[PDB]
Amino acid sequence: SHIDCRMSPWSEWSQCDPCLRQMFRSRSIEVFGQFNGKRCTDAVGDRRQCVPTEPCEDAEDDCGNDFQCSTGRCIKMRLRCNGDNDCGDFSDEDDCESEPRPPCRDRVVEESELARTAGYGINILGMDPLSTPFDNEFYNGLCNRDRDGNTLTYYRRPWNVASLIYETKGEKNFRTEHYEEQIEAFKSIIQEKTSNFNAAISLKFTPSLHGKGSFRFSYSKNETYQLFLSYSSKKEKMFLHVKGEIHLGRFVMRNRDVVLTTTFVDDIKALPTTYEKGEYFAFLETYGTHYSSSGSLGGLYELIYVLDK
Amino acid sequence: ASMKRKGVELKDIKRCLGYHLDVSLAFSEISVGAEFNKDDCVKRGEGRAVNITSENLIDDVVSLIRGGTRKYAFELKEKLLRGTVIDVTDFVNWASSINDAPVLISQKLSPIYNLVPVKMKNAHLKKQNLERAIEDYINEFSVRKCHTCQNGGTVILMDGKCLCACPFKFEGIACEISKQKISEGLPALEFP
Protein backbone atom coordinates (compact mmCIF):
# COMPACT_ATOMS: atom_id res chain seq x y z
CA SER A 1 0.00 0.00 0.00
CA HIS A 2 1.44 3.34 -1.16
CA ILE A 3 0.63 5.20 2.05
CA ASP A 4 1.37 8.91 1.70
CA CYS A 5 2.47 11.29 4.47
CA ARG A 6 -0.33 13.52 5.77
CA MET A 7 2.27 15.84 7.28
CA SER A 8 1.13 19.41 6.71
CA PRO A 9 -1.11 20.79 9.52
CA TRP A 10 -0.19 24.47 9.55
CA SER A 11 -0.67 26.84 12.48
CA GLU A 12 -1.13 30.59 12.90
CA TRP A 13 1.72 33.09 13.06
CA SER A 14 2.53 33.90 16.69
CA GLN A 15 3.95 37.13 18.10
CA CYS A 16 7.41 38.19 16.96
CA ASP A 17 10.36 37.95 19.35
CA PRO A 18 11.91 41.38 20.04
CA CYS A 19 15.28 40.24 21.35
CA LEU A 20 15.61 36.97 19.42
CA ARG A 21 14.19 38.51 16.20
CA GLN A 22 12.43 35.38 14.98
CA MET A 23 8.91 34.20 14.14
CA PHE A 24 7.18 30.94 15.03
CA ARG A 25 5.19 29.57 12.13
CA SER A 26 4.37 26.21 13.70
CA ARG A 27 3.71 22.73 12.34
CA SER A 28 3.21 19.13 13.46
CA ILE A 29 3.95 15.62 12.19
CA GLU A 30 1.02 13.21 11.85
CA VAL A 31 1.73 10.31 9.46
CA PHE A 32 5.03 8.63 8.56
CA GLY A 33 4.18 5.84 6.13
CA GLN A 34 4.62 2.23 7.19
CA PHE A 35 5.33 0.80 3.72
CA ASN A 36 7.64 1.35 0.72
CA GLY A 37 5.68 4.48 -0.29
CA LYS A 38 6.82 8.11 -0.24
CA ARG A 39 9.39 8.64 2.51
CA CYS A 40 8.83 11.94 4.32
CA THR A 41 11.53 13.32 6.64
CA ASP A 42 10.10 16.86 6.70
CA ALA A 43 11.29 18.46 9.92
CA VAL A 44 8.84 20.40 12.08
CA GLY A 45 9.53 24.11 12.55
CA ASP A 46 9.89 27.34 10.59
CA ARG A 47 11.69 30.63 11.18
CA ARG A 48 11.37 34.14 9.76
CA GLN A 49 12.95 37.54 10.30
CA CYS A 50 10.66 40.11 11.91
CA VAL A 51 11.00 43.79 12.80
CA PRO A 52 11.08 43.99 16.62
CA THR A 53 8.47 46.20 18.27
CA GLU A 54 9.44 45.88 21.94
CA PRO A 55 12.46 47.82 23.27
CA CYS A 56 14.12 44.61 24.57
CA GLU A 57 15.11 46.11 27.92
CA ASP A 58 15.76 42.75 29.61
CA ALA A 59 19.42 41.73 29.44
CA GLU A 60 21.86 39.39 31.17
CA ASP A 61 24.07 41.27 33.61
CA ASP A 62 27.62 40.12 34.32
CA CYS A 63 26.60 38.44 37.61
CA GLY A 64 27.36 41.69 39.49
CA ASN A 65 29.90 39.83 41.64
CA ASP A 66 33.48 39.77 40.33
CA PHE A 67 35.65 39.85 37.19
CA GLN A 68 33.60 38.97 34.12
CA CYS A 69 35.05 36.44 31.70
CA SER A 70 35.39 36.99 27.96
CA THR A 71 32.38 34.72 27.29
CA GLY A 72 29.87 35.35 30.09
CA ARG A 73 30.92 33.31 33.12
CA CYS A 74 32.26 34.67 36.41
CA ILE A 75 35.05 33.99 38.89
CA LYS A 76 33.68 32.59 42.14
CA MET A 77 36.64 33.06 44.49
CA ARG A 78 39.95 31.93 42.91
CA LEU A 79 39.57 31.88 39.12
CA ARG A 80 42.44 34.39 38.87
CA CYS A 81 45.96 33.68 37.58
CA ASN A 82 46.32 30.45 39.57
CA GLY A 83 46.51 27.86 36.80
CA ASP A 84 42.71 27.41 36.64
CA ASN A 85 41.74 26.98 32.98
CA ASP A 86 38.05 27.88 32.64
CA CYS A 87 37.51 30.27 29.71
CA GLY A 88 40.47 29.82 27.36
CA ASP A 89 44.11 28.77 27.13
CA PHE A 90 45.12 32.27 28.25
CA SER A 91 41.74 34.02 28.51
CA ASP A 92 41.44 33.95 32.30
CA GLU A 93 45.23 34.03 32.82
CA ASP A 94 45.61 36.96 30.40
CA ASP A 95 46.41 39.43 33.20
CA CYS A 96 48.91 37.98 35.70
CA GLU A 97 50.18 40.66 38.08
CA SER A 98 51.24 38.37 40.94
CA GLU A 99 53.53 35.36 40.64
CA PRO A 100 52.07 32.29 38.89
CA ARG A 101 51.32 30.41 42.11
CA PRO A 102 50.61 26.74 41.29
CA PRO A 103 47.36 25.42 42.79
CA CYS A 104 48.85 21.97 43.41
CA ARG A 105 52.47 20.94 43.95
CA ASP A 106 52.20 17.17 43.49
CA ARG A 107 52.58 15.67 40.02
CA VAL A 108 49.08 14.67 38.89
CA VAL A 109 48.69 13.74 35.22
CA GLU A 110 45.65 15.13 33.42
CA GLU A 111 42.76 12.77 32.66
CA SER A 112 43.76 11.53 29.19
CA GLU A 113 40.93 10.02 27.09
CA LEU A 114 39.27 8.73 30.29
CA ALA A 115 35.84 9.67 31.73
CA ARG A 116 36.94 13.34 31.55
CA THR A 117 34.31 13.66 28.80
CA ALA A 118 31.47 12.61 31.09
CA GLY A 119 28.69 14.40 29.20
CA TYR A 120 26.41 12.30 27.01
CA GLY A 121 23.30 13.24 25.05
CA ILE A 122 21.63 9.88 24.44
CA ASN A 123 18.27 10.00 22.67
CA ILE A 124 15.63 7.60 24.00
CA LEU A 125 14.08 7.59 20.51
CA GLY A 126 17.43 7.82 18.72
CA MET A 127 20.64 5.88 19.30
CA ASP A 128 23.82 5.62 21.44
CA PRO A 129 24.93 8.57 23.61
CA LEU A 130 26.24 11.84 22.21
CA SER A 131 29.18 14.10 23.11
CA THR A 132 29.38 16.33 26.19
CA PRO A 133 26.83 19.19 26.39
CA PHE A 134 28.79 21.05 29.10
CA ASP A 135 32.32 22.08 29.99
CA ASN A 136 34.10 19.32 31.91
CA GLU A 137 37.62 20.79 32.22
CA PHE A 138 37.08 23.59 34.76
CA TYR A 139 37.91 22.81 38.40
CA ASN A 140 37.07 24.83 41.49
CA GLY A 141 39.90 24.61 44.03
CA LEU A 142 42.42 22.17 45.49
CA CYS A 143 42.99 19.16 43.24
CA ASN A 144 41.08 16.07 44.35
CA ARG A 145 43.40 13.08 44.10
CA ASP A 146 42.35 10.05 42.06
CA ARG A 147 45.04 7.60 43.22
CA ASP A 148 43.62 4.52 41.50
CA GLY A 149 43.89 2.62 38.24
CA ASN A 150 45.79 -0.22 36.61
CA THR A 151 49.21 1.44 36.72
CA LEU A 152 50.75 3.87 39.22
CA THR A 153 49.54 7.25 37.97
CA TYR A 154 47.53 10.15 39.40
CA TYR A 155 44.54 11.49 37.46
CA ARG A 156 42.37 14.56 38.00
CA ARG A 157 38.63 14.61 38.64
CA PRO A 158 36.83 17.74 37.37
CA TRP A 159 34.54 19.76 39.60
CA ASN A 160 31.64 18.95 37.25
CA VAL A 161 32.02 15.20 37.85
CA ALA A 162 31.01 14.23 41.38
CA SER A 163 32.61 10.76 41.33
CA LEU A 164 34.94 8.68 39.16
CA ILE A 165 35.39 5.02 40.11
CA TYR A 166 37.92 2.70 38.47
CA GLU A 167 36.27 -0.63 39.31
CA THR A 168 37.25 -3.21 36.67
CA LYS A 169 34.15 -5.37 36.97
CA GLY A 170 33.76 -8.31 34.61
CA GLU A 171 30.99 -10.85 34.04
CA LYS A 172 29.50 -13.10 31.38
CA ASN A 173 26.50 -15.37 30.86
CA PHE A 174 25.59 -18.26 28.59
CA ARG A 175 22.45 -20.28 27.93
CA THR A 176 21.36 -23.24 25.82
CA GLU A 177 18.20 -25.17 25.03
CA HIS A 178 17.00 -28.10 22.93
CA TYR A 179 13.49 -29.04 21.82
CA GLU A 180 12.44 -32.33 20.24
CA GLU A 181 9.13 -33.51 18.79
CA GLN A 182 8.30 -36.79 17.06
CA ILE A 183 5.06 -38.45 15.99
CA GLU A 184 4.39 -41.58 13.93
CA ALA A 185 1.20 -43.45 13.01
CA PHE A 186 0.70 -46.66 11.04
CA LYS A 187 -2.61 -48.01 9.72
CA SER A 188 -3.48 -51.23 7.89
CA ILE A 189 -6.90 -52.43 6.72
CA ILE A 190 -7.64 -55.60 4.73
CA GLN A 191 -10.97 -56.94 3.46
CA GLU A 192 -11.75 -60.32 1.90
CA LYS A 193 -14.99 -61.82 0.59
CA THR A 194 -15.68 -65.11 -1.21
CA SER A 195 -18.86 -66.22 -2.98
CA ASN A 196 -19.74 -69.57 -4.57
CA PHE A 197 -23.05 -71.00 -5.78
CA ASN A 198 -24.24 -74.30 -7.26
CA ALA A 199 -27.44 -75.30 -9.05
CA ALA A 200 -28.13 -78.81 -10.38
CA ILE A 201 -31.53 -80.24 -11.35
CA SER A 202 -32.14 -83.41 -13.37
CA LEU A 203 -35.32 -84.68 -15.04
CA LYS A 204 -36.17 -88.09 -16.48
CA PHE A 205 -39.41 -89.58 -17.80
CA THR A 206 -40.02 -93.13 -19.06
CA PRO A 207 -43.56 -94.60 -19.00
CA SER A 208 -41.88 -96.46 -26.65
CA LEU A 209 -41.25 -93.16 -24.85
CA HIS A 210 -38.09 -91.97 -23.10
CA GLY A 211 -36.94 -88.70 -21.58
CA LYS A 212 -33.78 -87.40 -19.90
CA GLY A 213 -32.75 -83.93 -18.78
CA SER A 214 -29.95 -82.60 -16.59
CA PHE A 215 -29.21 -78.99 -15.62
CA ARG A 216 -25.91 -77.79 -14.17
CA PHE A 217 -24.78 -74.39 -12.93
CA SER A 218 -21.73 -72.94 -11.18
CA TYR A 219 -20.64 -69.61 -9.72
CA SER A 220 -17.31 -68.26 -8.48
CA LYS A 221 -16.40 -64.87 -7.02
CA ASN A 222 -14.03 -63.22 -4.57
CA GLU A 223 -13.13 -59.59 -3.83
CA THR A 224 -10.02 -58.80 -1.77
CA TYR A 225 -9.53 -55.24 -0.52
CA GLN A 226 -6.35 -53.82 1.01
CA LEU A 227 -5.68 -50.48 2.69
CA PHE A 228 -2.51 -49.06 4.23
CA LEU A 229 -1.84 -45.67 5.80
CA SER A 230 1.26 -44.20 7.43
CA TYR A 231 2.13 -40.83 8.94
CA SER A 232 5.31 -39.47 10.50
CA SER A 233 6.53 -36.04 11.59
CA LYS A 234 9.57 -34.79 13.50
CA LYS A 235 10.32 -31.32 14.86
CA GLU A 236 13.41 -29.95 16.59
CA LYS A 237 14.24 -26.50 17.98
CA MET A 238 17.43 -25.08 19.48
CA PHE A 239 17.95 -21.73 21.20
CA LEU A 240 21.24 -20.58 22.71
CA HIS A 241 22.92 -17.22 23.28
CA VAL A 242 25.79 -15.69 25.25
CA LYS A 243 26.64 -12.18 26.42
CA GLY A 244 29.64 -10.61 28.13
CA GLU A 245 30.48 -7.16 29.50
CA ILE A 246 33.96 -6.02 30.53
CA HIS A 247 33.38 -3.02 32.78
CA LEU A 248 36.17 -0.43 32.91
CA GLY A 249 35.09 2.64 34.88
CA ARG A 250 32.12 4.44 36.36
CA PHE A 251 31.29 8.10 36.98
CA VAL A 252 28.47 10.16 38.47
CA MET A 253 27.92 13.72 37.25
CA ARG A 254 27.15 16.27 39.96
CA ASN A 255 23.46 17.11 39.68
CA ARG A 256 23.43 20.72 40.92
CA ASP A 257 26.09 23.44 41.20
CA VAL A 258 27.76 22.36 37.95
CA VAL A 259 29.44 24.51 35.31
CA LEU A 260 28.46 24.53 31.63
CA THR A 261 30.24 25.21 28.35
CA THR A 262 30.15 28.54 26.54
CA THR A 263 28.45 26.95 23.51
CA PHE A 264 25.50 25.54 25.46
CA VAL A 265 25.09 28.65 27.63
CA ASP A 266 25.00 30.83 24.51
CA ASP A 267 22.26 28.56 23.14
CA ILE A 268 20.27 28.90 26.37
CA LYS A 269 20.94 32.65 26.37
CA ALA A 270 19.86 32.94 22.72
CA LEU A 271 16.69 30.93 23.32
CA PRO A 272 13.02 31.94 22.94
CA THR A 273 10.49 32.03 25.77
CA THR A 274 7.08 31.83 24.01
CA TYR A 275 7.03 28.04 23.49
CA GLU A 276 8.82 27.87 20.14
CA LYS A 277 8.36 24.16 19.44
CA GLY A 278 10.13 24.58 16.10
CA GLU A 279 13.43 25.75 17.56
CA TYR A 280 13.05 23.55 20.65
CA PHE A 281 12.69 20.48 18.43
CA ALA A 282 15.75 21.74 16.54
CA PHE A 283 17.59 22.43 19.80
CA LEU A 284 16.51 19.00 21.03
CA GLU A 285 18.43 17.17 18.29
CA THR A 286 21.58 19.23 18.90
CA TYR A 287 22.15 18.20 22.54
CA GLY A 288 19.82 15.20 22.81
CA THR A 289 16.68 14.91 24.91
CA HIS A 290 18.17 13.94 28.29
CA TYR A 291 21.73 13.65 29.57
CA SER A 292 23.44 10.93 31.63
CA SER A 293 23.61 11.38 35.39
CA SER A 294 25.83 8.29 35.78
CA GLY A 295 27.58 6.20 33.14
CA SER A 296 29.80 3.13 32.84
CA LEU A 297 32.85 3.30 30.58
CA GLY A 298 33.95 0.03 29.02
CA GLY A 299 32.53 -2.29 26.37
CA LEU A 300 30.32 -5.35 25.89
CA TYR A 301 29.83 -8.12 23.34
CA GLU A 302 26.92 -10.46 22.66
CA LEU A 303 26.19 -13.54 20.56
CA ILE A 304 22.78 -14.93 19.59
CA TYR A 305 22.01 -18.16 17.72
CA VAL A 306 18.71 -19.76 16.73
CA LEU A 307 17.72 -23.05 15.10
CA ASP A 308 14.45 -24.64 14.04
CA LYS A 309 13.72 -28.01 12.42
CA ALA B 1 13.46 -33.98 30.21
CA SER B 2 12.22 -36.74 27.92
CA MET B 3 8.86 -38.32 27.11
CA LYS B 4 7.92 -41.36 25.02
CA ARG B 5 4.59 -43.10 24.45
CA LYS B 6 3.78 -46.03 22.17
CA GLY B 7 0.46 -47.61 21.24
CA VAL B 8 -0.23 -50.46 18.82
CA GLU B 9 -3.68 -51.71 17.80
CA LEU B 10 -4.48 -54.65 15.52
CA LYS B 11 -7.95 -55.95 14.66
CA ASP B 12 -8.85 -58.87 12.39
CA ILE B 13 -12.26 -60.48 11.83
CA LYS B 14 -13.13 -63.47 9.64
CA ARG B 15 -16.60 -64.95 9.19
CA CYS B 16 -17.84 -67.35 6.51
CA LEU B 17 -21.13 -69.08 5.72
CA GLY B 18 -21.81 -72.48 4.16
CA TYR B 19 -24.99 -74.10 2.87
CA HIS B 20 -25.66 -77.31 0.94
CA LEU B 21 -29.10 -78.37 -0.31
CA ASP B 22 -29.84 -81.52 -2.31
CA VAL B 23 -33.27 -83.01 -3.06
CA SER B 24 -33.94 -86.03 -5.28
CA LEU B 25 -37.40 -87.36 -6.14
CA ALA B 26 -38.44 -90.52 -7.97
CA PHE B 27 -41.86 -91.70 -9.15
CA SER B 28 -43.65 -95.64 -15.41
CA GLU B 29 -40.45 -93.85 -14.38
CA ILE B 30 -40.07 -90.23 -13.25
CA SER B 31 -36.94 -88.64 -11.77
CA VAL B 32 -36.74 -85.19 -10.16
CA GLY B 33 -33.55 -83.63 -8.83
CA ALA B 34 -32.59 -80.45 -7.02
CA GLU B 35 -29.28 -79.09 -5.71
CA PHE B 36 -28.68 -75.62 -4.24
CA ASN B 37 -25.38 -74.70 -2.59
CA LYS B 38 -24.51 -71.34 -1.01
CA ASP B 39 -21.08 -70.12 0.10
CA ASP B 40 -20.16 -66.70 1.46
CA CYS B 41 -17.12 -65.59 3.48
CA VAL B 42 -16.36 -62.20 5.02
CA LYS B 43 -13.08 -60.81 6.38
CA ARG B 44 -12.35 -57.53 8.17
CA GLY B 45 -9.02 -56.06 9.22
CA GLU B 46 -7.88 -52.99 11.12
CA GLY B 47 -4.52 -51.68 12.28
CA ARG B 48 -3.36 -48.68 14.31
CA ALA B 49 -0.04 -47.47 15.71
CA VAL B 50 1.01 -44.60 17.98
CA ASN B 51 4.64 -43.44 18.29
CA ILE B 52 5.38 -40.10 19.98
CA THR B 53 8.77 -39.02 21.37
CA SER B 54 9.49 -35.70 23.10
CA GLU B 55 12.69 -34.44 24.74
CA ASN B 56 13.63 -31.12 26.34
CA LEU B 57 17.03 -29.80 27.42
CA ILE B 58 17.91 -26.66 29.40
CA ASP B 59 21.38 -25.34 30.29
CA ASP B 60 22.41 -22.05 31.91
CA VAL B 61 25.82 -20.67 32.89
CA VAL B 62 26.89 -17.39 34.51
CA SER B 63 30.06 -15.98 36.06
CA LEU B 64 31.54 -12.73 37.35
CA ILE B 65 34.87 -11.34 38.54
CA ARG B 66 36.31 -8.03 39.71
CA GLY B 67 39.45 -6.46 41.13
CA GLY B 68 43.12 -6.35 40.18
CA THR B 69 44.72 -5.00 37.01
CA ARG B 70 42.80 -5.65 33.81
CA LYS B 71 45.59 -7.80 32.32
CA TYR B 72 45.88 -10.39 35.11
CA ALA B 73 42.19 -10.31 36.07
CA PHE B 74 40.78 -11.40 32.71
CA GLU B 75 43.65 -13.81 32.06
CA LEU B 76 42.18 -15.63 35.06
CA LYS B 77 38.70 -15.25 33.54
CA GLU B 78 39.53 -16.87 30.20
CA LYS B 79 41.31 -19.86 31.77
CA LEU B 80 38.72 -20.49 34.50
CA LEU B 81 35.78 -20.75 32.07
CA ARG B 82 35.97 -24.29 30.63
CA GLY B 83 39.77 -24.21 30.80
CA THR B 84 40.06 -27.28 33.07
CA VAL B 85 43.79 -26.50 33.61
CA ILE B 86 44.32 -24.30 36.68
CA ASP B 87 47.67 -22.53 36.42
CA VAL B 88 50.05 -21.76 39.27
CA THR B 89 51.45 -18.47 37.96
CA ASP B 90 48.14 -16.76 37.14
CA PHE B 91 46.84 -17.01 40.71
CA VAL B 92 50.14 -15.68 42.06
CA ASN B 93 49.94 -12.86 39.51
CA TRP B 94 46.32 -12.35 40.60
CA ALA B 95 47.63 -11.92 44.16
CA SER B 96 49.97 -9.10 43.14
CA SER B 97 47.34 -7.78 40.70
CA ILE B 98 44.64 -7.27 43.35
CA ASN B 99 47.16 -5.50 45.59
CA ASP B 100 47.24 -2.55 43.18
CA ALA B 101 43.49 -2.13 42.50
CA PRO B 102 41.21 -3.65 45.15
CA VAL B 103 37.41 -3.44 45.48
CA LEU B 104 34.76 -3.81 48.17
CA ILE B 105 33.77 -7.28 49.39
CA SER B 106 31.98 -6.77 52.71
CA GLN B 107 30.49 -3.37 53.52
CA LYS B 108 29.04 -2.21 56.84
CA LEU B 109 26.41 0.47 56.34
CA SER B 110 25.58 3.72 58.14
CA PRO B 111 23.07 6.49 57.34
CA ILE B 112 24.31 9.79 55.95
CA TYR B 113 22.16 12.01 58.19
CA ASN B 114 24.27 10.77 61.12
CA LEU B 115 27.38 12.15 59.35
CA VAL B 116 26.16 15.77 59.20
CA PRO B 117 28.49 18.06 61.22
CA VAL B 118 27.11 19.03 64.62
CA LYS B 119 26.75 22.62 65.96
CA MET B 120 26.34 23.96 62.42
CA LYS B 121 23.92 26.69 61.31
CA ASN B 122 20.82 24.46 61.22
CA ALA B 123 22.39 21.02 61.64
CA HIS B 124 19.69 19.38 63.77
CA LEU B 125 16.68 20.48 61.71
CA LYS B 126 18.46 19.52 58.48
CA LYS B 127 19.46 16.21 60.11
CA GLN B 128 15.87 15.13 60.76
CA ASN B 129 14.93 16.72 57.42
CA LEU B 130 17.26 14.38 55.53
CA GLU B 131 16.08 11.58 57.84
CA ARG B 132 12.59 12.09 56.43
CA ALA B 133 14.18 12.24 52.97
CA ILE B 134 16.18 9.00 53.26
CA GLU B 135 13.09 7.22 54.61
CA ASP B 136 10.92 8.56 51.79
CA TYR B 137 13.60 7.91 49.15
CA ILE B 138 13.76 4.15 49.74
CA ASN B 139 9.94 4.08 49.96
CA GLU B 140 9.22 6.41 47.02
CA PHE B 141 10.25 4.28 44.02
CA SER B 142 11.05 0.56 44.17
CA VAL B 143 9.78 -2.84 43.05
CA ARG B 144 7.19 -2.58 45.83
CA LYS B 145 5.38 0.23 43.99
CA CYS B 146 5.72 -1.26 40.49
CA HIS B 147 3.55 -4.04 39.05
CA THR B 148 4.02 -7.77 39.59
CA CYS B 149 5.27 -9.94 36.73
CA GLN B 150 3.93 -13.36 35.70
CA ASN B 151 5.05 -16.90 36.53
CA GLY B 152 6.92 -15.70 39.61
CA GLY B 153 9.33 -13.63 37.54
CA THR B 154 11.67 -11.64 39.77
CA VAL B 155 10.95 -7.97 39.04
CA ILE B 156 13.88 -5.55 38.85
CA LEU B 157 14.18 -1.79 38.33
CA MET B 158 16.95 -0.40 36.10
CA ASP B 159 16.44 3.36 35.63
CA GLY B 160 12.70 3.37 34.97
CA LYS B 161 12.51 0.09 33.04
CA CYS B 162 10.54 -2.14 35.43
CA LEU B 163 11.45 -5.40 33.72
CA CYS B 164 11.01 -8.84 35.28
CA ALA B 165 13.54 -11.66 35.02
CA CYS B 166 11.68 -14.68 33.65
CA PRO B 167 12.68 -18.25 34.60
CA PHE B 168 14.84 -20.45 32.40
CA LYS B 169 12.10 -22.74 31.05
CA PHE B 170 9.99 -19.70 30.11
CA GLU B 171 10.35 -17.10 27.37
CA GLY B 172 11.18 -13.40 27.63
CA ILE B 173 9.41 -10.13 28.37
CA ALA B 174 6.11 -10.11 30.31
CA CYS B 175 6.34 -13.91 30.77
CA GLU B 176 3.29 -14.33 28.54
CA ILE B 177 4.30 -16.85 25.86
CA SER B 178 5.51 -20.14 27.31
CA LYS B 179 7.90 -21.66 24.73
CA GLN B 180 7.97 -25.06 26.43
CA LYS B 181 5.97 -25.20 22.83
CA ILE B 182 3.32 -27.94 22.79
CA SER B 183 3.36 -30.84 20.33
CA GLU B 184 0.46 -31.01 17.86
CA GLY B 185 -0.56 -34.18 16.05
CA LEU B 186 -2.99 -34.50 13.14
CA PRO B 187 -3.73 -38.03 11.84
CA ALA B 188 -6.00 -36.71 9.06
CA LEU B 189 -5.52 -38.01 5.54
CA GLU B 190 -3.58 -35.56 3.33
CA PHE B 191 -5.73 -33.79 0.76
CA PRO B 192 -2.98 -33.68 -1.89
Next chain:
Amino acid sequence: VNITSENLIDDVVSLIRGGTRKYAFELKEKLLRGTVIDVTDFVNWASSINDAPVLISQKLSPIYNLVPVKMKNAHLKKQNLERAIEDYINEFSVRKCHTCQNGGTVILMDGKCLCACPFKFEGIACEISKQKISEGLPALEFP
Protein backbone atom coordinates in the same frame (compact mmCIF):
# COMPACT_ATOMS: atom_id res chain seq x y z
CA VAL C 1 0.37 -41.94 -1.59
CA ASN C 2 3.90 -40.81 -0.67
CA ILE C 3 4.44 -37.23 0.52
CA THR C 4 7.49 -35.96 2.44
CA SER C 5 8.04 -32.40 3.67
CA GLU C 6 10.87 -30.94 5.75
CA ASN C 7 11.69 -27.39 6.86
CA LEU C 8 14.81 -25.93 8.47
CA ILE C 9 15.43 -22.48 9.98
CA ASP C 10 18.68 -21.06 11.36
CA ASP C 11 19.56 -17.57 12.60
CA VAL C 12 22.71 -16.02 14.08
CA VAL C 13 23.56 -12.55 15.41
CA SER C 14 26.48 -10.94 17.22
CA LEU C 15 27.87 -7.55 18.23
CA ILE C 16 30.95 -6.01 19.84
CA ARG C 17 32.24 -2.56 20.79
CA GLY C 18 35.11 -0.85 22.55
CA GLY C 19 38.89 -1.02 22.40
CA THR C 20 41.20 -0.31 19.48
CA ARG C 21 39.96 -1.50 16.11
CA LYS C 22 42.85 -3.94 15.63
CA TYR C 23 42.41 -5.98 18.82
CA ALA C 24 38.61 -5.65 18.89
CA PHE C 25 37.86 -7.30 15.55
CA GLU C 26 40.66 -9.83 15.99
CA LEU C 27 38.49 -11.05 18.86
CA LYS C 28 35.47 -10.93 16.54
CA GLU C 29 36.92 -13.17 13.83
CA LYS C 30 38.16 -15.82 16.27
CA LEU C 31 34.99 -15.91 18.40
CA LEU C 32 32.62 -16.54 15.46
CA ARG C 33 32.90 -20.29 14.76
CA GLY C 34 36.57 -20.25 15.77
CA THR C 35 36.18 -22.85 18.55
CA VAL C 36 39.74 -22.06 19.76
CA ILE C 37 39.73 -19.34 22.43
CA ASP C 38 43.18 -17.75 22.59
CA VAL C 39 44.94 -16.48 25.70
CA THR C 40 46.75 -13.48 24.19
CA ASP C 41 43.78 -11.94 22.37
CA PHE C 42 41.74 -11.50 25.55
CA VAL C 43 44.76 -10.02 27.34
CA ASN C 44 45.27 -7.70 24.36
CA TRP C 45 41.54 -6.92 24.52
CA ALA C 46 42.09 -5.90 28.15
CA SER C 47 44.75 -3.34 27.22
CA SER C 48 42.79 -2.43 24.08
CA ILE C 49 39.63 -1.38 25.92
CA ASN C 50 41.71 0.74 28.32
CA ASP C 51 42.47 3.16 25.48
CA ALA C 52 38.98 3.56 23.95
CA PRO C 53 36.08 2.58 26.24
CA VAL C 54 32.33 2.92 25.66
CA LEU C 55 29.13 3.09 27.70
CA ILE C 56 27.71 -0.07 29.26
CA SER C 57 25.25 1.07 31.94
CA GLN C 58 23.83 4.59 31.81
CA LYS C 59 21.76 6.34 34.47
CA LEU C 60 19.48 8.94 32.93
CA SER C 61 18.49 12.49 33.89
CA PRO C 62 16.40 15.11 32.06
CA ILE C 63 18.09 18.09 30.43
CA TYR C 64 15.65 20.72 31.72
CA ASN C 65 17.01 20.00 35.22
CA LEU C 66 20.49 20.98 33.97
CA VAL C 67 19.55 24.54 32.91
CA PRO C 68 21.53 27.11 34.95
CA VAL C 69 19.52 28.73 37.74
CA LYS C 70 19.10 32.51 38.31
CA MET C 71 19.54 33.17 34.59
CA LYS C 72 17.57 35.70 32.50
CA ASN C 73 14.43 33.54 32.13
CA ALA C 74 15.67 30.22 33.49
CA HIS C 75 12.45 29.11 35.20
CA LEU C 76 10.04 29.83 32.35
CA LYS C 77 12.43 28.23 29.85
CA LYS C 78 12.83 25.25 32.20
CA GLN C 79 9.12 24.39 32.22
CA ASN C 80 9.03 25.35 28.53
CA LEU C 81 11.58 22.66 27.64
CA GLU C 82 9.77 20.37 30.09
CA ARG C 83 6.70 20.68 27.88
CA ALA C 84 9.00 20.13 24.89
CA ILE C 85 10.69 16.98 26.19
CA GLU C 86 7.28 15.54 27.12
CA ASP C 87 5.86 16.37 23.68
CA TYR C 88 9.01 15.19 21.87
CA ILE C 89 8.80 11.60 23.14
CA ASN C 90 5.03 11.65 22.50
CA GLU C 91 5.11 13.41 19.11
CA PHE C 92 6.63 10.74 16.84
CA SER C 93 7.16 7.10 17.82
CA VAL C 94 5.97 3.57 17.06
CA ARG C 95 2.86 4.39 19.12
CA LYS C 96 1.65 6.84 16.45
CA CYS C 97 2.66 4.72 13.44
CA HIS C 98 0.68 1.77 12.05
CA THR C 99 0.83 -1.80 13.34
CA CYS C 100 2.53 -4.49 11.25
CA GLN C 101 1.20 -8.00 10.57
CA ASN C 102 1.90 -11.35 12.23
CA GLY C 103 3.14 -9.64 15.39
CA GLY C 104 6.05 -8.03 13.57
CA THR C 105 7.98 -5.71 15.88
CA VAL C 106 7.66 -2.23 14.37
CA ILE C 107 10.70 0.05 14.42
CA LEU C 108 11.34 3.64 13.33
CA MET C 109 14.60 4.54 11.56
CA ASP C 110 14.45 8.16 10.34
CA GLY C 111 10.94 8.14 8.88
CA LYS C 112 10.96 4.57 7.56
CA CYS C 113 8.40 2.84 9.80
CA LEU C 114 9.45 -0.70 8.93
CA CYS C 115 8.49 -3.78 10.95
CA ALA C 116 10.84 -6.65 11.75
CA CYS C 117 9.14 -9.84 10.56
CA PRO C 118 9.69 -13.19 12.33
CA PHE C 119 12.15 -15.80 11.10
CA LYS C 120 9.63 -18.26 9.61
CA PHE C 121 7.96 -15.40 7.68
CA GLU C 122 9.07 -13.37 4.67
CA GLY C 123 10.04 -9.70 4.45
CA ILE C 124 8.34 -6.33 4.18
CA ALA C 125 4.71 -5.89 5.31
CA CYS C 126 4.61 -9.54 6.47
CA GLU C 127 2.09 -10.32 3.73
CA ILE C 128 3.52 -13.30 1.83
CA SER C 129 4.21 -16.29 4.07
CA LYS C 130 7.02 -18.29 2.39
CA GLN C 131 6.52 -21.33 4.62
CA LYS C 132 5.29 -22.06 0.74
CA ILE C 133 2.56 -24.72 0.63
CA SER C 134 2.96 -28.03 -1.19
CA GLU C 135 0.66 -28.61 -4.17
CA GLY C 136 -0.15 -32.05 -5.55
CA LEU C 137 -1.89 -32.86 -8.83
CA PRO C 138 -2.56 -36.55 -9.61
CA ALA C 139 -4.01 -35.70 -13.03
CA LEU C 140 -2.81 -37.65 -16.05
CA GLU C 141 -0.33 -35.69 -18.20
CA PHE C 142 -1.78 -34.47 -21.48
CA PRO C 143 1.48 -34.88 -23.42
